[PDB]
């Protein structure tokens, strides 16, 4: 198990782990897990850690004939409807030659005291598509078993890990409510039909 990428400002602040980390340019794919987790010379320069804003910049020197830099930008703030600080990975920013490609990250959120884990935090539709864009982009990304904690990181250990994998999803919830209403209607209809009784006698 390769160790997590641990940015340090007097102590571990941003921990980033991924069973796989692959990136593609013009449909040309490449694996970065070996070049990312466990490498002691990782070009983490450009990272930053506010008290309430984190930027993890992983840079690779010869990638795709240029120095590429993936910046994961998260921010945690106090949400009034609770007393909890909730951190969300706001976006991803791929810097290539004098150029920037932005990816929105959809469902990477959770209490700032808990890391966030999600299988296939990827830009592919087949793999969740949490990295999404409306401007067509030449970049694609796949982080398999992506677990990140930017705030409240104590020591080398990820805190408990909220994850996108839930019991229900908006589509499942809508379908279940529709089916529940229609099951109520069908149960009413079937109860009234089953109450049908036939006469046991006929007039002389």
């Amino acid at each position: 198990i390769h160790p997590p990428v641990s940015y340090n400002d007097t102590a571990p602040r941003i921990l980033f782990w991924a069973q796989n980390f692959s990136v593609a340019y013009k449909d040309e794919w490449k694996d970065l897990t070996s070049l990312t987790f466990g490498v002691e010379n990782l070009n983490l320069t450009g990272s930053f850690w506010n008290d309430s804003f984190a930027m993890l910049s992983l840079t690779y020197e010869p990638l795709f004939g240029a120095t590429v830099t993936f910046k994961f930008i998260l921010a945690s703030r106090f949400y009034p409807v609770s007393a909890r600080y909730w951190f969300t990975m706001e976006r991803l920013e791929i810097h290539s030659n004098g150029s920037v490609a932005h990816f929105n990250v959809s469902q990477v959120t959770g209490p700032s005291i808990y890391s966030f884990h999600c299988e296939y935090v990827s830009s592919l539709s087949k793999k969740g598509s949490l990295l999404v864009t409306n401007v067509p982009s030449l970049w694609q990304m796949t982080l398999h078993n992506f677990q990140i904690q930017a705030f409240n990181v104590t020591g080398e250990q990820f805190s408990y890990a909220s994850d996108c994998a839930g019991f229900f999803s908006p589509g499942i919830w809508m379908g279940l409510l529709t089916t529940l209403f229609m099951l109520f209607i069908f149960t009413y209809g079937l109860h009234m039909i089953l109450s049908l009784k036939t006469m046991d006698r006929f007039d002389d």
Partner: protein, 52 residues
């Protein structure tokens, strides 16, 4: 090590709901059938009043 999270499958919602509702429906069907057989009319009403 590193307290890595449990590798939940991204489709957890789908399989959880599929299994939960399929098995709930199957259990309800089995219960209803077993009640319709257990509470079946004994069929010897022609013999209830002869034995009793």
């Amino acid at each position: 090590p590193y307290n890595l999270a449990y590798k939940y499958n991204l489709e957890y919602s789908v399989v959880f709901n599929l299994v939960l509702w399929i098995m709930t429906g199957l259990a309800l069907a089995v219960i209803i059938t077993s009640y319709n057989i257990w509470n079946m009319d004994p069929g010897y009403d022609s013999i209830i009043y002869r034995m009793t």
